[PDB]
Amino acid sequence: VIREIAKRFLEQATINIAEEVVREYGDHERTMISVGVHFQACCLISDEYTLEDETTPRYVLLEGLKRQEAISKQNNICSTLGLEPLRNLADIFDRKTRRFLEVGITKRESDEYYQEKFNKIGNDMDIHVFTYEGKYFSNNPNGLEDIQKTRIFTFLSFVSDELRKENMFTEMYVTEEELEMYKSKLFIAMRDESVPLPYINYEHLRTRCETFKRNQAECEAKVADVASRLKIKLEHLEENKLRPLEIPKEKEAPYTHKFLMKDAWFFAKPHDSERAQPQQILYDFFEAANMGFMTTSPKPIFGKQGLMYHSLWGQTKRAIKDKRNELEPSEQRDFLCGIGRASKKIQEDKWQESREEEFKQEETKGAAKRGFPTWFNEEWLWAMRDSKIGDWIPMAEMPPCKNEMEDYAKKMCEELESKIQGTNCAREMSKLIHTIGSLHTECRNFPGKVKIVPIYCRGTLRGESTDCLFGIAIKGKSHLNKDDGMYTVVTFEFSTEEPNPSKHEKYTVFEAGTVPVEAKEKKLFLYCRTTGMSKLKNDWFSKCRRCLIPTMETVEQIVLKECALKEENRVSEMLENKRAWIAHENGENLTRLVSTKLKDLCRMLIVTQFYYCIYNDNQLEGFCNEQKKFLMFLQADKDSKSAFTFNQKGLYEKIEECIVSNPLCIFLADRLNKLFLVAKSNGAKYFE
């Protein structure tokens, strides 16, 4: 800011006087400050010691002044003595030296400016040139011993330090000795070339822009745009065409999760404090879970490749039997985890041309489309049912509370924390954090080496801290340069339930044996699935514990909205005596809902936040945006505000475009159509 810094070092009232001079000068911006400095220069010259005997002052100030009274006061001072001009109007007249008094201040060394003034006037006036650097380089008559020179170099070093504060070097330029851009050769034909089509050069365009006035022929073009439009809004009370979505009637989408949730079987042992590294837990469960009774048939039940999984499973069985987690190179690992399976990246240096031999080109297809899954509801209801093993997630402790609202937030953390630890989702998140964490650290500490990383958990059983064992993971010699890389993981899983060729499409199910179960000795199956993770996928799945934040954010917004509308401390009964309508039944849907308590509601909220943490894709993102639009339409239905849409055709094209193969997307679309059925059971904007 010019004015704010200008009120720091320069005087208060002088801003209006120097600004008044610039109002009498013209369209110039920087020189204001200079004139103010010059005026305070005069304020240091002609203030206190102006020839007090013969009180008519020695310094006749007729330069910084109104441009009316310099000639009159010039004819009032010089009418007694009488002087001669020197081809220029004088700055300060003088009668003690009977001469003029020139005031000029420069930034550079004062030689060149004094020689330019020597070309202008010579030395017939009384030249006073003062430098910010500290050079009294002026005419020979001088001030005797006064403090005007001392305070004026103090003032020019002063204001010079102000120039050195805020970088003001191309700002103290006298107009005679900044407001001109460097007019080049090639830009001036560039600026004239990119002018609009009815214009010749930038000059004619600028003169027309400076001399433009608006007209009332604007509305002729506006209504002339209204005529060739052919557009109508579409209301909702009469043409409520909010139709159900087009679910693809195709092959059912398979079980696509990286791990197994509901079809898992595990083995427990008491956990040791010393035996803690994953190879140590792999060996302790090699003696604990009996692999001597792990006999696999060479013929799979279904699938494609059975022999490589058989020799691979026996090979890793004798590998962990020798208590060393590194597979020797054979054709099984040379075939399964991609070893030598990559494209020969040939740069453009030689092409070794041929008459139509290895005719190369490019081809893209897109994504394959599937149908509605029906196995997902059973895993949803399984996912919110309690399993007797206690805590799964390693959460930290509670800080000590004051007499503040820390009793409230402590109460919410203790109740919500006490409800979320028992669910099977907590077991799955512990599975992902422990297994994906150990595979992540093995992806750092040993590239190029195929390791054997177990799939396990850790939970409290009858108060005693125990651990589990679910599967076997095999790393695929990850060389992760960038965020991608797609290293291959081979998963051997343990199951206690019969397979399914419709759900378990990506599996190569064998039979393992029998499992004793207390309540007789049921069967035992071994599953096989090769897959591929990513480094950024390890970073985002390894940190899947932070799903409590939108869940507890949602519940706490419900409670704080409720008691914010009730204006009374009603929390502990509001957490118990409040219903939530969820889970309509299968046979009927018309106003047939299940009111549950709030703790089961936060169970289902951590379920859907967890399924959002699993299935995060592009189709999920666009589907979530468009379902925000449909929630805005449904909220517009909840108060009958008569909403409207301009085009209901391409909207479903955008929604159905981004619904291809994601089963969570297809499921929430199906439940969204059923939500439109329940909203159609009361409100009138929808279909059947």
């Binding site: 005719f359 190369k360 909205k561």
Partner: protein, 696 residues
């Protein structure tokens, strides 16, 4: 039994049931392969939105030019987006703009913006995002690109004595007047380049894929420019920044109370039959229908009475945009039927290897070929991301202060690509008249509203910048989860910085207290999981808890331990602004306090309390310039012990005040200090020999 999570929305508002519908917990989508087809669709789609064929041949550049203003061919599908601007129409919107508030408006704002350019140093050009250095033609931060640019200035002709914006830009225009520029390549061979290639290189804009963008199925390409176009864009952003701050219908800097004042104010001005309908709207293809020729026209009208320097100075960056080049990525790939051998064809050989492409690539390529360079492309009407954002909002206000003359009108609020429009009228066919006139003024000016992503109601039930607003209640901005733990520097700067992040999201956002307590315990959990530190009562036995569990009987008062040193949490929600050490030094043992807080430590030697500050090892996988420049840094920092706080003023010489500084403190410490002739005469000989060695 079936189940549907959304059924909670049958009896509640949308202000709380909308964070359920944000999947902000998993991995963002990322790009793969090349970003070539995205730029081909962007440029070919932009020329496909031109609605014209009238071409002007260029005598400067060896490629053709297609005009975009006042060249319309009115197709029947006017609902398709157009790329044409009527200049007298928008100048009439400028006169209609300034006639609403004040008379000396552009003169006063041009005096403020003119008043705050000349006092700007050019080091502000280094305080930016990632830029495109043209020396090795890669993407580098702005300090490196300005370093190589100034190095090219002092390398080709003369030195640099500017230290301003204006003499540096005049130096760039001097470089445009230079016929031959010498810079360094590879081990630093100085090569030369002509006049036309410097023109073709300084107007080159790099295109990559926008990574980590939540909310789109198809990826969108983002573009980063070089260096010699940035400062003029900074000037334009200062001008339009002061314009948008002076206005009252913009939200680029509070975004909440302005809607309260326009709803409460414009509901106080209705008739006995008039009413209000608001429409949530989202402009689609916003970055492909803002031609910089209109920026040249309006910036010639804003500066009609400003200055002579400013009048010529705000007329270069749209001219640089009207002839901008577009990078083509890095090519594509081609493979045989067996899918084993796959050659990589770059953007250079794409012209000769045209016949190895798919149908969509050839449809985007045969419609882009006569505007291609040999390695780049030509564009004169686009405005991609990383460009003028504070200036199209002014076009939003100019569309939102129109007068047509009943007594039916509108107002509203604009954002970068979101707009909330408030219509006041009498009947529904007259609502069709006013809305279709708003589509008329936006379509004639060049703002293409999407018809699928817009709706409206009678009261306040609208969307603005992903904030769904109810009739009474207000939802909050959906917060980023991974912004919580990205400090990663120290055992002390990861938890207290997390308390700063949770504190700032508590103040700025809503962020209910128990949710912040839960996120606090989660970040505490990931902190104890990162550095492998456990509480003493926990039975975790690794290589660091053995020492702590062994020496725990040495500590008398057990809560005097640190969380990074084996203690439990004592910070709380009322203690987020206070670090753990300041809370805990009043309960420490004096052997523990004197033992940990020794500055004689082999880890710290070689904005919180530093007692655990260590440096990890660097990687094992331009290296002389960092050596020489950091010799200048440690040397000049070693001479002047208090110099990183204050700005290093004084540009007459550096080493002269260094030599007089070593003489100054050598004589100062000498004369009633040292007193011995061989040291003073020896250092005198070193200063004289260094001065005679340097000055010659």
């Amino acid at each position: 039994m079936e189940i549907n999570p959304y059924l909670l929305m049958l009896n509640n508002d949308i202000t709380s049931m909308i964070s359920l519908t944000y999947p902000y917990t998993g991995a963002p989508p990322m790009s793969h392969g090349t970003s070539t087809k995205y730029s081909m669709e962007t440029v070919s789609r932009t020329y496909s939105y031109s609605r014209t064929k009238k071409e002007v041949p260029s005598g400067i550049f060896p490629i053709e030019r297609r005009k975009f203003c006042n060249t319309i061919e009115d197709k029947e599908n006017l609902e398709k987006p157009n790329g044409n601007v009527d200049i007298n129409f928008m100048l009439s919107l400028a006169e209609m703009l300034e006639e609403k508030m004040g008379k000396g408006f552009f003169k006063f704002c041009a005096n403020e913006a003119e008043a705050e350019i000349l006092k700007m140093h050019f080091s502000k050009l280094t305080e930016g995002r990632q830029t495109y250095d043209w020396t090795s033609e890669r993407n580098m931060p702005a300090a490196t690109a300005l370093q190589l640019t100034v190095d090219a200035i002092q390398e080709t002709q003369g030195t640099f004595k500017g230290t301003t914006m204006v003499e540096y830009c005049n130096k760039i225009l001097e470089m445009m007047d230079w016929p031959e520029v010498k810079f360094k390549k590879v081990t630093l061979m100085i090569t030369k380049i002509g006049r036309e290639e410097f023109i073709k290189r300084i107007c080159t804009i790099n295109t990559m894929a926008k990574d980590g963008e939540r909310g789109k199925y198809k990826r969108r390409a983002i573009a980063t420019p070089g260096m010699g176009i940035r400062p003029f864009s900074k000037i334009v952003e200062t001008l339009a920044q002061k314009i948008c701050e002076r206005l009252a219908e913009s939200g680029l800097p509070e975004k909440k109370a302005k809607l309260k004042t326009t709803v409460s104010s414009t509901n106080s001005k209705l008739q006995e039959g008039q009413f209000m309908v608001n429409i949530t709207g989202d402009n689609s293809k916003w970055n492909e229908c803002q031609q910089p020729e209109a920026y040249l026209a309006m910036l010639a009208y804003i500066t009609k009475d400003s200055s002579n320097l400013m009048k010529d100075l705000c007329s270069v960056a749209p001219t640089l945009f009207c002839n901008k080049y577009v990078k083509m990525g890095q090519g594509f790939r081609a493979k045989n039927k067996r899918k084993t051998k796959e050659i990589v064809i770059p953007a250079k050989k794409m012209k000769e290897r045209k016949e190895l492409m798919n149908a969509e690539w050839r449809d985007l390529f045969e419609t882009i070929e006569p505007y291609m360079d040999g390695e780049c492309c030509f564009l004169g009407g686009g405005m991609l991301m990383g460009m003028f954002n504070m200036l199209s909002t002014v076009f939003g206000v100019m569309t939102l202060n129109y007068r047509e003359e009943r007594n039916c009108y509108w107002t509203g609020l604009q954002s970068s690509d979101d707009f909330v429009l408030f219509c006041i009228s009498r009947t529904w066919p007259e609502m069709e008249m006013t809305i279709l006139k708003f589509i008329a003024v936006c379509k004639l000016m060049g703002i293409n509203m999407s018809l699928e992503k817009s709706y409206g109601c009678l009261p306040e039930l609208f969307e603005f910048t992903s904030m769904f607003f109810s009739g009474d209640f207000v939802s909050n901005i959906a917060l980023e989860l991974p912004a919580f733990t990205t400090a990663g520097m120290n055992e002390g700067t990861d938890f207290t910085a997390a308390m700063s992040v949770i504190r700032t999201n508590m103040i700025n956002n809503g962020l209910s207290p128990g949710t912040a307590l839960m996120a606090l315990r989660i970040c505490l959990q990931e902190f104890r999981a990162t550095y492998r530190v456990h509480p003493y009562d926990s039975g975790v036995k690794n290589h660091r808890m053995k020492i702590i569990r062994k020496f725990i009987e040495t500590i008398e008062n057990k809560d005097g331990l640190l969380i990074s040193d084996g203690g439990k949490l004592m910070n709380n929600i009322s203690s987020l602004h206070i670090p753990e050490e300041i809370l805990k030094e009043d309960l420490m043992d004096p052997s523990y306090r004197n033992r940990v807080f020794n500055p004689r430590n082999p880890f710290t030697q070689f904005a919180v309390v530093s007692t655990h500050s260590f440096r990890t090892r660097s990687n094992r996988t331009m290296a002389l310039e960092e050596k020489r420049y950091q010799v200048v840094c440690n040397m000049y920092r070693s001479v002047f012990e208090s110099a990183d706080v204050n700005t290093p003023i004084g540009s007459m010489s550096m080493g002269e005040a260094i030599e007089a500084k070593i003489l100054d403190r050598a004589r100062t410490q000498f004369e009633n200090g040292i007193i011995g002739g061989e040291e003073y005469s020896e250092i005198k000989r070193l200063i004289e020999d260094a001065k005679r060695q340097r000055l010659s």
